Amino acid sequence: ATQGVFTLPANTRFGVTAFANSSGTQTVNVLVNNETAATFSGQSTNNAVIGTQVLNSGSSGKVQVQVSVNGRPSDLVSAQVILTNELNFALVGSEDGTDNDYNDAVVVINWPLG
Amino acid sequence: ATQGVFTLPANTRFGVTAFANSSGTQTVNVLVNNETAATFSGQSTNNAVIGTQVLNSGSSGKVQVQVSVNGRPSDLVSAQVILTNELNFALVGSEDGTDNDYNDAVVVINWPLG
Amino acid sequence: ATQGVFTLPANTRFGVTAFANSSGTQTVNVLVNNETAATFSGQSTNNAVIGTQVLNSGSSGKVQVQVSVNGRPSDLVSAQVILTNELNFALVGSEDGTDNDYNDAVVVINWPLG
Amino acid sequence: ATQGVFTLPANTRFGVTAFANSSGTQTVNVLVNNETAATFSGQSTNNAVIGTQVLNSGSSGKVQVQVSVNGRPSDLVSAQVILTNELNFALVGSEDGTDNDYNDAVVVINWPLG
Ligand SMILES: C[C@@H]1O[C@H](NC(=O)c2ccc(-c3cccc(CN)c3)o2)[C@@H](O)[C@H](O)[C@@H]1O
Ligand SMILES: C[C@@H]1O[C@H](NC(=O)c2ccc3[nH]ccc3c2)[C@@H](O)[C@H](O)[C@@H]1O
Ligand SMILES: C[C@@H]1O[C@H](NC(=O)c2ccc3[nH]ccc3c2)[C@@H](O)[C@H](O)[C@@H]1O
Ligand SMILES: C[C@@H]1O[C@H](NC(=O)c2ccc3[nH]ccc3c2)[C@@H](O)[C@H](O)[C@@H]1O
Ligand SMILES: [Ca+2]
Ligand SMILES: [Ca+2]
Ligand SMILES: [Ca+2]
Ligand SMILES: [Ca+2]
Ligand SMILES: [Ca+2]
Ligand SMILES: [Ca+2]
Ligand SMILES: [Ca+2]
Ligand SMILES: [Ca+2]
């Protein structure tokens, strides 16, 4: 199944935050309407926040997270969870290796903001 | 029901990261084994990361998030989600007012690290 | 925070299914647009499926679950999770006593159908 | 990433329930310790329950859901959600075709029971 693709309400502000947990340099690209809107890179085995940003879902509401290491796309796992019918998290894990910890880059999208 | 309380595997590193979305300064306490292990304070209406840290679950595995604003405990909402039977997210939202956006302080706990 | 309330897409079929795990007789009411649309009852300590039904979310998409035992409202916990940006589960747990297993009545709402 | 695999505590009673939403006849196998512990089949486009059972996680704690149609394994999606640090849901969706609704067989695993 496709992973790392989320439909937000249109014209909604959201946060996106990436964490790194690998010997490999993570490249995290965040697309909105199929266009890169944020990019983060870094290497950490201590959960560094390699980037955080605030974006708007725009007219399409389409948000995609891609994770690659040195040009190689990592395997993605994702889901969306909603608490009290209001608070939204879109979650991504990624595996760049063989150990299957799926934490090599971890991306969390949150909304609403404000 | 109790919210903001999570049982992690014992003696395991985990990340904890807080965001603010409120006109009021947020005070986030992270307890491990019923004792303060980290404290974050900050103010934003645009999802600023007011703190991030790496902690150890220690012998109890017991992690509790509390959020207070001007000394009043905020109402919490929480859950844990596990992806590919491996990647763990413990999620917290908080409400300090009347609008019920539950994003006033948003707390994400992630494990494993590394 | 409010629990057991979910906004579904409007005018969409969904499944609602209740399970019992208590010595108490569970009564589960499912409201659509603030009116009772389904009522399930039963007693089991072995996860009986006391009811399952297909409903339509109607014009508001508002679905609410309430649980009671002998007229006493149970305390509810809930969340929604979405898999591969398509497959939706709205989940309810309920507590009628003092052990805090929150499984006394368990309700699962699923969509899409078909 | 692997999907439909869950680690339960050892020797834990759990509910598993399956629904069908396809023209294809679903076969759902639930493995415990890599051995078939329950098999369900049915066909519905209206979310009919095609199986429900109570099983034991046994010494391994290893639970796997497999879905096939006409001898062909369906593509799975899965996640685990924990409410109030106590109530567990292990959720499975499956796709047997080309529409990507991932509801062809929907499987819910819940614990604790009792
Ligand atoms: C921007 C909005 O900020 C709201 N919070 C408050 O308004 C708040 C936090 C503390 C206080 C506060 C303290 C002391 C005296 C007073 C009364 N003047 C008030 O107000 C959020 O709930 C909302 O979702 C929005 O993000
Ligand atoms: C420290 C360990 O790092 C592993 N990743 C690596 O070892 C790794 C992955 C991709 C790479 N591309 C270039 C060098 C390189 C190295 C991770 O997959 C593993 O989970 C763990 O975090
Ligand atoms: C077997 C146990 O049953 C408990 N519930 C009860 O024993 C219970 C709760 C409410 C009641 N109202 C009238 C009779 C009655 C009995 C549950 O709360 C507990 O989790 C466990 O399932
Ligand atoms: C009614 C529709 O049925 C679809 N499935 C099928 O039409 C389907 C899938 C696999 C099959 N193998 C043999 C016959 C056969 C038929 C489903 O994939 C689709 O989502 C929808 O529920
Ligand atoms: Ca890895
Ligand atoms: Ca790693
Ligand atoms: Ca608020
Ligand atoms: Ca707010
Ligand atoms: Ca109980
Ligand atoms: Ca019970
Ligand atoms: Ca299908
Ligand atoms: Ca289908």
Q: Which of A19, A21, A23 for mutating ligand 2's site (highest number of atoms within 8 Å of CB)?
A: A23
- Which of B62, B81, B76 has its CA nearest to residue B105? B76
Which distant-in-sequence residues (6+ apart) come within 8 Å of C39 by Cβ?
C27, C28, C29, C30, C51
Longest CA pairwise span in chain B (Å): 40
Coil/strand/helix, residue D79: strand
Total domains in the fold of chain A: 1
User: Cα(A85)–Cα(C79) distance, rounded to whole angstroms?
Assistant: 7
What three-state secondary structure class fits C37? strand
Measured at the CA of B50, the angle between CA B45 and CA B56, to 5 degrees, comes to 145
Which has the closest alpha carbon to D47: A82, C108, C44? C108
Q: Using an 8 Å CB-CB cutoff, list chain B residues near C102.
A: 1
Cis peptide before C112 (omega within 30 of 0): yes
* Cα(D103)–Cα(B106) distance, integer angstroms: 32
CA–CA separation, D94 vs B83, rounded Å? 16
Using only C-alpha atoms, what is the Rg of chain D? 13
> A65-92 in b/e burial notation, b at 16+ Cβ within 10 A?
bbbbbeeeebbbbbbbbbbbbbbbbbbb
Residue nearest to atom 2 of ligand 2 (CA): A22
Helix (H, G, I), strand (E, B) or coil at C88: strand
Distance in Å, alpha carbon of B19 to nearest chain D alpha carbon: 22
Resolution (A): 1.7
CATH code, C6: 2.60.120.400
CA dihedral of D69, D72, D74, D75, whole degrees rounded to 10? -170
Q: Could you tell me which of B24, B6, B1 has the C-alpha nearest to residue B92?
A: B6
In order, the DSSP letters of B47-113 are: --EEEEEEEE-TTT-EEEEEEEETTEEPEEEEEEEEETTTEEEEEEEEE-SSS----SEEEEEEE--
**CA atoms of C27 and C32, how far apart (whole Å):** 17
Optimal mutation site among C86, C99, C104, interface D, most CBs of chain D within 10 A: C86
Identify any residues that bridge with D28 across adjacent strands, giving them in sequence order. Answer: D40, D67
Residue D46: φ, ψ to 5°: -135, 30
Residues 23-62 of C with CB under 8 A from A: none
Measuring CA to CA, how many Å separate C75 from each of A67, B6, C53, D4?
A: 41, 19, 23, 30
Phi-psi region of A84 (alpha: psi -120 to 50; beta: other; left: phi over 0): left
Residues sharing a CB contact under 8 Å with residue C45, sequence separation 6 or more, in sequence order: C20, C21, C22, C23, D113, D114
CB contact under 8 A, A1 and C83: yes
> Chain A closest CA to B4's CA: distance in Å?
12
Range of the domain at C84: 1-114
Provide CB contacts within 8 A for C32, sequence distance 6+.
Answer: C55, C56, C57, C58, C62, C63
Residue D63 CA, distance from chain mean position = 9
Give dist(CA B29, CA B33) in Å, integer: 13
Residue type present at position B17: T
Q: Which two three-digit tokens encode residue A26? A: 């993570």
Provide the β-strand partners of residue A34: none
Show the beta-strand stretches assigned E in A33-86: 35-56, 62-69, 72-73, 75-83
| Measured CA distances, A103 to A58, B56, B63 (Å) | 29, 17, 20
Measure the CA–CA gap between D53 and A110, rounded to whole angstroms. 37
